Paper text:
Legionella pneumophila is an opportunistic pathogen that causes the potentially fatal pneumonia known as Legionnaires’ disease. The pathology associated with infection depends on bacterial delivery of effector proteins into the host via the membrane spanning Dot/Icm type IV secretion system (T4SS). The Dot/Icm complex of L. pneumophila is one of the largest known T4SSs. The Dot/Icm T4SS has as many as 300 protein substrates, a striking contrast to the H. pylori Cag and B. pertussis Ptl T4SSs, each of which transports only one virulence factor.
(a–b) The outer membrane cap (OMC) disk has been reconstructed to 2.8 Å resolution using C13 symmetry. A DALI search of Dis2 returned no significant structural similarity among PDB entries, making its function difficult to infer. Together, the predicted membrane interaction sites in DotC, DotD1, DotD2, DotK, would anchor the Dot/Icm T4SS to the outer membrane at seven positions per asymmetric unit. We identify ‘chain 2’ as Lpg2847 (residues 29–320), now referred to as Dis3. Finally, we identified ‘chain 3’ as DotF (DotF1, residues 208–266).
Residue numbers in the entry:
A (entry chain FH), I (entry chain GH): 271 to 361
B (entry chain EK), J (entry chain FK): 40 to 188
C (entry chain FC): 28 to 35, 60 to 161, 173 to 268
D (entry chain EN), H (entry chain FN): 40 to 115
E (entry chain FD): 24 to 162
F (entry chain FL): 42 to 65, 88 to 234
G (entry chain Fd): 25 to 55
K (entry chain GC): 28 to 35, 60 to 76
The structure:
C-alpha cells in the first residue's frame, strides 16, 4: 500500500485562499493566518513551528510555509532565533 | 488583555536619553533604522591600558538602559586607538577593550541574540588631527545596531 | 480570588458592527476608485489571452512537500504541479472589479456603558471589512499567478498548448433563411502536463 | 500617549503592525494584532493538548480533546 | 530635535495591501519575461514595417482604453495621412490600452502594433502617406 | 528682490533688503542679518524642510528625499521645493575647498538596470545643479547605486520609503 | 504660482503601487 | 438655474439628452436619463453577479443569482 | 453535433422591436435599451460592452450592436476611449 | 439620485471665464461646436526662448480652470513664431514651447483623452505687419478643441 | 447611519399617471 | 500547569479557610512532582536505549526507501 | 545540497568565543545532517546538507 | 557529539574543485528541477564549451534541483556534481574546452 502523496488543499493555503466550507480563526502575537475545515487547522505563516507537531507541510518559492495539523489553542514559534508563542482563538 | 506596546519602553524616555547623552558628550546617531553610539576612550579606560575606571560603570549603566529600549538581533562593538609602540600591541589593546565593554554589556540585561566584538587598532581614523594620545578624538569605541521592526 | 487576605450592551455590540462594516466598505470602494488606471495596468487580463480568444488555464505549484500519513511510513516530494482551472472560450476578458469591489448598502434601520460597546462593535466591523478585502486580494492574486505560471511552463515545455479545429461551411440554409459564411470552431485537445521528462527544456539566463 | 515628546501619531503601518509618528521614527505601540509580541504567559486550561472538549458534565471534571483530564480546572 | 527626512501624507491599509500584492506580481512578471526572453531570442524589429518621416514627429499624450481602429484613425488624421483598413473585423473586438506621455506618433503606432499582437498589424507607407491597419487571416 | 526660479543663478543680496526695510534700526537689522546668515540657522531651516544633516569627525553628509525633491520616477527636479535647494547651496558655500560626492539610492521595486539608470540620472541631475551655482567641475563626482546598501527594511512600507534618497558627502 | 499635479503619488504606498504598475507595463511590453 | 447668465431654457434636445439655452450654446444640465454620465460609483449589493435572488429567508443571509453569498448585506 | 447558429430574436432587437412576451427594463447613464424575456437580457446599443460577458451577438449595417446575455444590474461600457458604467433597473 | 448636470461645471462660470479672458487679452472664440484659445507668446515665454516665466503659471491655471468646464476627446496645441535665424531653430523652438505648455496642461487635471502638439515655425501668419519680434501679433500659441455632446 | 458620532402619496402617484398619459397622447 | 482565574466566590471561618489554603498548595505541589517524575522517566528511558545500543543489547531500526 | 523538509535545528548559548570555535560547535551539533567547511584562501564558508532522503 | 561525528580529510574529498577557466566566472540565474543532462548541456552552451556523455541512462533518471539568483557557472557545476552523488560525475577539461558527464557502471 503506497501512502498518499499530500493534501492538495495546501496549495490554496499557500496562495492564501481559505478552504471552502471552513471558518476563520483569530491568531494573535504574530503574522499568521489559520482556518478550520474538518477539525484540522490549516496555518499560513513564514515562521518556524516547534512544539505542537504537524501532519503535512508545503513550502512556496518565496519562503512561505503551509501546515496541516490538529487543533490546538497555542503555537510555539521561532522568530529570528528567539522562541515565542502564538494564541489561537475561535476553536 | 493583549499588550499595547513593547514592555519597559517609551518614546519620550528614548528622546530624553538621546538628548541627555548628546549633552553629556556621547554621540548618538540614527540614519534610517541604523543606530550608532560613539564613546571616547578617555571616558571609559585609563591611559592606554585595558582597565576600566570605577566611575565609568554609571555611564555603562546609562548605555545599557538606553539599549534596553529597542528590539534587536545583533550588536557590533568596535574599538579604535592610536599609534603607541607597534601594530600588535594596539590591536591586542583594542580587542581587550572591546571584550571588557561587551562583557559588561552582556552581563547587563540587553535582549539581543548576538554581540560581535572587534578591535581595528589605528587603521580607520575619523580626524586628520593626530597629536593626542587617548585624548585624541579618533580613539574611541563604537556600538552599532539595527532596530528590528 | 487572588490572595488569602483578598478572600478574607449586546445590542450595542450588534448595532455598531453593521455601521462600521458599511462605512469601511464605502471608504474601501472610494480608495479602489482612486486607483482605477493603476489596477488596470497591474491586473491586465487582456494581454494574456491566447490566439483563438481562449483564457489560459490556472496552474498551482508546491515545493518541498512532506506527508506523515501514519507511524512507520512517510512520503516526500521535491515539487508538485496541479491544474486548478481549465481553458475555455471567452468573449470578454476579466476585470478587477469582479474580484475587488465590495458591496455597499446604506443601513437606515437603527447611556452610561452604551458608548464603549458601540465603539467596540465599530472596531469589530472595521476589522471584518479589512479581512474580507484581504481575502478578495488573495483570490485575484491566485488566478493571475496561475496564468503567469502557465506561460512560464509553456516556455519551458511542460504543458501542451490547446488545439483548435475549424470547419468552413459554405452558403447553408433553406429558402426561408440563409447564412453566408458559416464557420464552426471547436477545441479538441485541452492543455495538460506532460510526464516525459526527457523532452523538457532548461533555461540559463546570463 | 504613544508618540509623546514627538509630533504625534501619523499613521498605523499594518505591514509591520506599528504606529508611525509625525517624525521619521517608529513608535513602540502596536496597532494591529498581527505584530511581533514576545508572549510567554498564556491563560486557560487543557493547554498543550487539543483544548477543552465542549461536553457539558454532571460532575466537575474537565476533559481535553486527547483524552487527558485536567486536574486544575476540575472541581474537587 | 531628531527627525528623519521622508514624512509624507498618511497611508491607507487597503493601498498597503494592494502594493504588497503588486510588488510580487511585478517580480513574477520579471522572472517570466526573463525566462521567455532567454528561451526565444527575437531577431526582427517593426522599424522596417513602420518607418518615420517628416510630420510624424509631432507629439501626443494619450490615455485610451478602447478599440484600435478609432485611435489609429485619429493618429493618422493628426499625422495628415490617409487611413486604410484591410481584412474583416472580428466579432470579438480587438481592445488596446495605451497610457503614455509626450512621445512621437511613430512610437505610439509601434506600441499599438506591438500590443495588437497576432490579431492586427500596422504598416506605414510615407511615399503615398498611407497608414494601413490589417486584420489577421483567422476564423 | 528674489526670483523664485533659482534667482537666475545669481548670488542673492539677502541682507541689504532686510537692513534697508528695518529703518522706517540699523543695529537691529545688522543683528538680524548676522543671526540669519549663521550656519546653525541654515541647519535649523534645513531641519524645517525635510533634509537631514549628519556631522561625524570631519565628514559631513546631507540626506535629501527624492520623493519630495524630484518628480515621480523621472530625473526632473521639482521646482516647488526651491528654498531647500537654495539652502543646500547656502550651506555648501561655507566650504570652498572640500570635494563633493553625490550618490543616488532607490528601493527594491523594478529591474536592476532600471534602478541603476534612475539612480545615475538623479545623481547627474543633482551634480549638474550643484555645478551650475558656482562649484567647479573638478570638485564633483556623481554615482548611482541601486538597492545595494540600504539603511532600512525594504519589506515594510515606511522603511522602503526611507531608502529612496540622495546623499551628499564632503570633507 | 506653480501647482503640484492633482493625481500625484504623495503617499508612500501609492508610490510603490505606481512604480509596480510601471514595471508590470514595461515587462508586458518586453514580452 | 441651468441657463444662468443666458437667455433661459429653449427646449430639451433628446437626441443628445441636453438642454438648449436661448443662445446657441448647449447647457450643462441633463434632461433625459439616456445621457452620457460618468458613473463610477453604484450602490446595491450582489453587484458583479446576477443580482439579489428574491427568496425570503428565515436567516439574514443574502444569496446572489450565481450561487454566491454576499457577506456585506448578510446579517451577523 | 453541430452547435446552433444564433438566436433569431436579435434581428428584431437590432431593428428595435422588443421580443413578444418580454418586459421593459430601465437603463440609466447612457444610450441603451434592454428587455427581459426568458430570464435572459437583450441589450440594444452602439457602445462597447467590456466586463459582464455576453452569449450571442449581432451587428447592423450602421454600427448598432445587439447582445444576448445573462441578467445583471450593472454594465461596463467604453464610450470614446473612456470606461464608464450603466445602471439597469427593473430586474 | 441621478446627477442633474456634469460635475464642476456651470454656464454662468463659462460666460464669466470667457468675459474675463477676453478682457485680459487672451482670445476665446467659438464657432459651432469648435473652440479656440489664442495666446500671445510674450505673456507666457521669454524673448525667443522656451523658458516659462514664473508669473505665467497663474494664467495657465486660469486656462486649465476654463478647460475643466467642458467634455472633450482631443485637444490640439499649435505654436507659431517669427523669423530670427533660420527655419530649423524656429521649428525646434515652437515644438519645445508647445511641449512645455501641453506638459503643464496635462499635469493639471484636464479630462481629455489625447493632446496633440505641433510647432509650425513662421509658416502661417495672420497679420502682414511683421516688424516686431515676440511682440508681433503673429507669434502665438493656439489651443483648439471640439465640445463633445 | 453614517458616522459613530451620528450613531451617538401612493394614490397621488396612481392618479397623476393616467392624466399625464392622456395629455401626452 | 494550568491556570484559570477563579472569579466565582466569621468566628471559625478564617482557620478553616487557611486550612483549605494549605491543602490547595499541597495538591499543586503533588501534581508538579508527578509531572517531574513523568518527564524524568521519559528522558532516562531515552538515555538507556543509547547506552544499551553502545553495549550491543538492542537492535537499531531499519529504513527502506 | 537540498534543504530537508524537516528543518535542522540548533541551540547555541555561549559567551566570548571565537568564530572558528563557534563554527566547530555548530558543526558538531549539526552532526550527520549538515557539515561546515572553511576555505581561507578563497574566503568561503560552505554549508552542505547530507545525501539522505 | 565529538564521539559520534565522523569526518573526511580534505585531501581525499571527492568533490569537483573550481576549474578557474575564464569563461566559467559569468554569473547566471537558474531555476530548474529535473534531469541533469539537459541543464548540464545548457550550462556548457552558456560557457561556450562542448558537452559529451559517457555511460548509459538508467530507467529512472537522475533528478537534481538548482534554484539560484546570482551564482557562477563553476559553482553551479559543483552543486550539480555534489547533488548527483555516486551515480554520475562531471569532469571539466579547459585545454580542449569540454565537459564530460560520466555514469556509474
Amino acid at each position: 500500500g503506497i501512502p498518499p502523496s499530500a493534501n492538495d488543499l495546501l496549495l490554496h493555503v499557500l496562495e492564501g485562499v481559505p478552504p471552502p466550507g471552513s471558518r476563520r480563526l483569530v491568531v494573535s502575537g504574530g503574522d499568521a493566518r489559520a482556518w478550520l475545515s474538518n477539525e484540522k487547522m490549516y496555518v499560513r505563516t513564514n515562521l518556524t513551528i516547534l512544539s505542537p507537531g504537524w501532519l503535512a507541510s508545503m513550502t512556496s518559492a518565496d519562503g512561505t510555509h503551509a501546515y496541516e495539523m490538529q487543533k490546538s489553542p497555542v503555537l510555539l514559534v521561532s522568530w529570528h532565533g528567539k522562541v515565542m508563542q502564538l494564541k489561537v482563538e475561535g476553536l | 488583555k493583549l499588550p499595547c506596546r513593547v514592555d519597559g519602553a517609551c518614546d519620550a524616555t528614548i528622546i530624553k536619553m538621546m538628548t541627555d547623552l548628546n549633552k553629556k558628550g556621547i554621540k548618538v546617531a540614527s540614519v534610517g533604522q541604523n543606530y550608532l553610539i560613539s564613546i571616547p576612550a578617555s571616558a571609559l579606560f585609563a591611559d592606554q591600558s585595558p582597565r576600566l575606571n570605577w566611575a565609568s560603570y554609571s555611564l555603562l549603566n546609562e548605555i545599557a538602559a538606553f539599549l534596553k529600549q529597542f528590539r534587536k538581533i545583533a550588536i557590533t562593538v568596535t574599538s579604535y586607538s592610536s599609534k603607541y609602540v607597534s601594530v600588535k600591541r594596539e590591536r591586542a589593546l583594542t580587542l581587550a577593550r572591546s571584550r571588557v565593554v561587551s562583557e559588561y554589556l552582556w552581563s547587563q540585561g540587553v535582549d539581543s541574540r548576538i554581540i560581535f566584538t572587534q578591535g581595528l587598532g589605528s587603521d580607520k581614523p575619523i580626524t586628520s588631527y593626530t597629536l593626542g594620545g587617548d585624548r585624541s578624538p579618533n580613539a574611541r569605541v563604537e556600538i552599532t545596531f539595527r532596530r528590528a521592526v | 480570588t487572588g490572595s488569602l487576605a483578598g478572600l478574607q450592551k449586546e445590542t450595542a455590540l450588534s448595532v455598531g458592527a453593521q455601521a462600521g462594516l458599511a462605512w469601511r466598505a464605502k471608504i474601501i470602494d472610494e480608495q479602489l476608485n482612486k486607483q482605477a488606471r493603476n489596477l488596470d495596468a497591474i491586473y491586465d487580463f487582456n494581454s494574456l489571452v491566447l490566439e483563438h480568444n481562449i483564457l489560459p488555464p490556472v496552474l498551482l505549484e508546491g515545493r518541498n512537500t512532506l506527508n506523515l500519513a501514519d507511524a512507520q511510513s512517510i512520503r516526500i516530494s521535491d515539487r508538485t504541479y496541479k491544474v486548478a482551472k481549465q481553458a475555455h472560450f471567452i468573449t470578454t476578458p476579466p476585470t478587477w472589479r469582479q474580484y475587488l469591489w465590495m458591496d455597499y448598502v446604506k443601513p437606515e434601520a437603527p447611556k452610561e456603558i452604551w458608548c464603549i460597546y458601540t465603539e467596540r462593535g465599530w472596531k469589530n466591523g472595521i476589522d471584518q471589512a479589512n479581512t474580507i478585502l484581504e481575502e478578495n486580494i488573495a483570490r485575484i492574486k491566485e488566478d493571475f499567478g496561475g496564468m503567469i505560471l502557465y506561460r512560464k511552463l509553456l516556455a519551458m515545455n511542460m504543458v501542451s498548448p490547446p488545439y483548435v479545429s475549424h470547419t468552413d461551411l459554405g452558403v447553408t440554409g433553406d429558402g426561408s433563411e440563409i447564412h453566408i459564411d458559416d464557420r464552426v470552431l471547436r477545441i479538441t485537445a485541452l492543455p495538460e502536463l506532460n510526464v516525459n521528462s526527457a523532452e523538457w527544456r532548461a533555461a540559463v539566463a546570463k | 500617549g504613544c508618540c509623546s515628546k514627538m509630533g504625534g501619531i501619523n499613521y498605523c503601518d499594518s505591514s509591520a503592525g506599528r504606529l508611525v509618528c509625525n517624525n521619521g521614527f517608529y513608535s513602540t505601540c502596536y496597532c494591529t494584532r498581527h505584530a511581533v509580541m514576545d508572549l510567554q504567559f498564556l491563560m486557560g486550561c487543557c493547554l498543550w493538548h487539543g483544548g477543552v472538549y465542549p461536553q457539558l458534565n454532571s460532575s466537575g471534571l474537565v476533559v481535553c480533546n486527547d483524552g487527558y483530564v485536567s486536574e486544575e480546572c476540575s472541581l474537587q | 530635535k531628531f527627525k528623519k527626512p521622508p514624512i509624507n501624507n498618511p497611508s491607507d491599509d487597503a493601498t498597503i495591501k494592494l502594493a504588497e500584492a503588486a510588488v510580487s506580481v511585478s517580480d513574477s512578471m520579471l522572472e517570466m519575461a526573463k525566462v521567455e526572453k532567454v528561451i526565444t531570442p527575437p531577431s526582427k524589429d517593426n522599424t522596417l514595417t513602420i518607418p518615420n518621416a517628416y510630420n510624424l514627429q509631432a507629439r501626443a499624450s494619450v490615455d485610451w482604453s478602447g478599440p484600435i481602429e478609432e485611435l489609429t484613425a485619429r493618429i493618422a488624421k493628426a499625422a495628415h495621412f490617409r487611413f486604410r483598413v484591410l481584412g474583416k473585423s472580428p466579432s470579438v473586438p480587438v481592445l488596446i490600452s495605451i497610457s503614455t506621455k509626450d512621445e512621437s506618433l511613430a512610437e505610439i503606432l509601434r506600441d499599438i502594433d506591438y500590443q495588437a499582437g497576432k490579431k492586427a498589424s500596422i504598416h506605414v507607407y510615407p511615399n503615398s502617406q498611407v497608414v494601413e491597419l490589417r486584420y489577421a487571416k483567422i476564423y | 528682490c528674489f526670483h523664485p526660479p533659482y534667482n537666475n543663478f545669481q548670488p542673492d543680496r539677502r541682507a541689504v533688503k532686510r537692513v534697508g526695510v528695518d529703518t522706517g534700526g540699523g543695529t537691529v537689522g545688522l543683528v538680524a542679518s548676522i543671526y540669519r546668515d549663521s550656519k546653525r540657522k541654515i541647519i535649523r531651516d534645513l531641519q524645517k524642510q525635510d533634509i537631514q544633516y549628519v556631522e561625524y569627525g570631519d565628514t559631513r553628509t546631507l540626506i535629501i528625499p527624492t520623493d519630495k525633491y524630484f518628480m515621480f520616477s523621472s530625473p526632473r527636479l521639482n521646482e516647488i521645493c526651491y528654498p531647500g535647494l537654495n539652502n543646500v547651496i547656502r550651506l555648501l558655500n561655507f566650504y570652498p575647498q572640500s570635494t563633493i560626492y553625490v550618490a543616488g539610492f532607490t528601493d527594491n521595486v523594478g529591474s536592476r538596470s532600471h534602478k541603476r539608470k534612475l539612480s545615475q540620472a538623479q545623481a547627474e541631475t543633482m551634480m549638474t545643479f550643484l555645478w551650475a551655482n558656482g562649484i567647479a567641475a573638478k570638485r564633483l563626482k556623481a554615482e548611482g547605486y541601486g538597492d545595494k546598501n540600504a539603511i532600512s527594511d525594504n519589506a515594510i512600507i515606511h522603511g522602503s520609503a526611507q531608502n529612496r534618497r540622495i546623499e551628499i558627502q564632503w570633507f
